[PDB]
Amino acid sequence: NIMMTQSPSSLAVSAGEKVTVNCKSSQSVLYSSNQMNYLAWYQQKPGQSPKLLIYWASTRESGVPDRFTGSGSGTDFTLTISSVQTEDLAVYYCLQYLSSWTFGGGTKLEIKRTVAAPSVFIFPPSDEQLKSGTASVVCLLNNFYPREAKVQWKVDNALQSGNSQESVTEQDSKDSTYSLSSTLTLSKADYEKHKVYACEVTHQGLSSPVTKSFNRGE
């Protein structure tokens, strides 16, 4: 059975840079009687089915932009994006279809851009939720780059470890930023036993850590 090794597994590129993805097949996929390489390249974006870019190693599918080109033959194949656009962030798969199908492991592509500091907002738990017996406190970091960010929760100056979950949006396909939410869960009894709820944000774009906080009852 023909195995497919894709490399690199992950890359970050500025918009406008050249992108290169490599695919090695364990056996040749060049069919000797028609001199065609039985190799396709796919783009897949979240929630979508994969989209064919290139087949026979180097023929573009119709409607596929010029910046996508395939090359190689035999066992070595490369998908090139000559000038990566902001919306090209995706997972790219090669596929051999000479003897059954085998997909590569996929290559996740992300975009780099100029540093951009988050706006931070903190939300107290609503009263409606407090009746239900649970207290959710939400910290929002809005439209920033890079994704790396430290969000520390403090309750009356007590570091909260392990009772918060973070969530990150897909990178924006126009301006390449992320937004991040961190949500601290507490019991109603615990919440109503403390005063100062604080969200401390450290990020490469802020000249010093930023703290958004509220006193329970303001």
């Binding site: 089915s49 989209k51 059954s100 907002f121 409606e128 949006t169 939410s181 949500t183």
Partner: protein, 209 residues
């Protein structure tokens, strides 16, 4: 339009059987083999097999050798994939994909879980500098997805609906936020439209300071 329309999402319990249907249209059905491809959440594409759509002969990949049955209804140009004795590792999205060219089904998400579907509770996220943020917390539902829109889809700029997270409870939770200029609150109204089709939940929550 050649197209492949797969059937809708499924929630089944460990041990049950699921049958996914793939409807083809716009070309001579029996003239192209049909492939099935598995994608587990966060994972790559894995070819499961292929069916001869003239003779119905199936060929199974090595890892899909026991509980997996490809079948046909040539009459309806429809390929079927049945999974027996479902396990947690069968939770994934399943695609049909036609030989030759770009044609894929939209996918069929299959969730294997003992947990029962539950509708979400929706709570306001209420309000700084020049920009105000507000939002909706959609918490404790199962399974995915929830959709969120604002002001019935008339507010899109500045909206962020986060990917859900799985809580220790075994239930999902997400937030939707939108940022607007501070000066604009109080004359403007903010309603989040929350939809959770599996429990048939539809909520419109007004958020305000």
């Amino acid at each position: 339009q050649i197209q492949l329309v797969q059937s809708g999402p499924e929630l089944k319990k460990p041990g049950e059987t699921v049958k996914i249907s793939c409807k083809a249209s716009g070309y001579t059905f029996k003239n192209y083999g049909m492939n099935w491809v598995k994608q587990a959440p966060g994972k790559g594409l894995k070819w499961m097999g292929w069916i001869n759509t003239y003779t119905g002969q199936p060929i199974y990949a090595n890892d899909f050798k026991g509980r997996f049955a490809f079948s046909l209804e040539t009459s309806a140009s429809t390929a079927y994939l049945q999974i027996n004795n479902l396990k947690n590792e069968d939770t994934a999205t399943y695609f049909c994909a036609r030989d030759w060219g770009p044609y894929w089904g939209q996918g069929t998400l299959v969730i294997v879980s003992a947990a029962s579907t539950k509708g979400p509770s929706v709570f306001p996220l209420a309000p700084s500098g020049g920009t105000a943020a507000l939002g909706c917390l959609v918490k404790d539902y199962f399974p995915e997805p929830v959709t969120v829109s604002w002001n019935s889809g008339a507010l899109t700029s500045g909206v962020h609906t986060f990917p859900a997270v799985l809580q220790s409870s075994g239930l999902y939770s997400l937030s939707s936020v939108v940022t607007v200029p501070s000066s604009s609150l109080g004359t403007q109204t903010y309603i989040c439209n929350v939809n959770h089709k599996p429990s048939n939940t539809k909520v419109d929550k007004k958020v305000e300071p």
